[PDB]
Amino acid sequence: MLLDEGWLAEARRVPSPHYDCRPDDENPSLLVVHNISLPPGEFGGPWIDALFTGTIDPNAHPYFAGIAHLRVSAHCLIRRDGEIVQYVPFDKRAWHAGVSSYQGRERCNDFSIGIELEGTDTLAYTDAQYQQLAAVTNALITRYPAIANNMTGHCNIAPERKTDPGPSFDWARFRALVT
Ligand SMILES: [Zn+2]
């Protein structure tokens, strides 16, 4: 697919207020793979769109109040059916990695894009999502070369704390489709 220098045309743009300047406007290299579903264990709700914009309703669900204290966002999301939703231009800083670390260098937000796979640590992602994740990845690799040589889980840059994208994530399947 195609890149309007930050934005994915194919997608459904959610204008998240939750971005800012990459420090010294450094360009991204490492892509991190995230997972998420809300409420935790269901798919298709509007609620992800919600969390990612800082508007989600703490009253919509006993699990939504537990996190209604965050302001967080991830560059793009892949829904179970392949649909790509984009909240923030790739060149900008997403509030996704958190307290993370990759190769001596923390605050991994700075230099990374974050892709969310709708799902759970323990349930297989769908064919469409492997096709889509790889699709987006090839694009960013073309814009940002280093990505092909920096790809990881949240669980890698934040062990113990994070386990996403989980043992479900079959890197084999995905890589099989990256350039
Ligand atoms: Zn994550």
Side-chain angles (χ1 to χ4, degrees):
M1 52 175 63
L2 293 61
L3 321 193
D4 181 78
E5 18 294 342
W7 272 98
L8 238 51
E10 178 55 10
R12 179 171 76 54
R13 307 173 163 241
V14 187
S16 178
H18 285 17
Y19 64 108
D20 59 31
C21 282
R22 292 190 185 261
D24 288 308
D25 326 89
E26 163 169 17
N27 294 349
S29 29
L30 173 61
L31 151 73
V32 183
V33 183
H34 278 272
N35 77 19
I36 202 151
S37 61
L38 317 154
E42 310 192 327
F43 313 89
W47 318 111
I48 300 179
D49 289 331
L51 191 57
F52 285 29
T53 64
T55 70
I56 184 184
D57 170 1
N59 306 301
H61 197 268
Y63 172 90
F64 291 172
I67 88 287
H69 45 112
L70 292 45
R71 298 147 72 176
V72 292
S73 80
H75 288 275
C76 310
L77 162 60
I78 327 310
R79 306 222 75 173
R80 293 298 278 198
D81 67 11
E83 262 189 281
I84 314 311
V85 191
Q86 196 182 183
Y87 314 91
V88 171
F90 291 117
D91 69 321
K92 295 304 152 203
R93 162 153 71 160
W95 307 343
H96 75 87
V99 187
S100 31
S101 225
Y102 183 82
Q103 283 177 52
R105 187 158 145 85
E106 306 150 290
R107 313 172 171 279
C108 303
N109 271 348
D110 289 350
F111 44 102
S112 58
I113 318 180
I115 288 335
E116 288 286 9
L117 300 185
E118 196 168 13
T120 59
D121 273 344
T122 60
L123 157 68
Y125 303 97
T126 76
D127 283 345
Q129 292 174 316
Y130 277 116
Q131 265 299 344
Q132 279 287 18
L133 180 62
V136 201
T137 304
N138 290 319
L140 291 161
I141 283 176
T142 298
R143 186 19 167 93
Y144 314 113
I147 302 170
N149 224 298
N150 287 251
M151 268 166 293
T152 203
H154 204 184
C155 60
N156 297 305
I157 61 168
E160 208 110 51
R161 186 174 76 76
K162 303 306 304 163
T163 55
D164 78 271
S168 45
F169 191 48
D170 174 351
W171 286 102
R173 163 120 66 132
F174 163 43
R175 285 183 184 275
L177 281 176
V178 186
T179 192

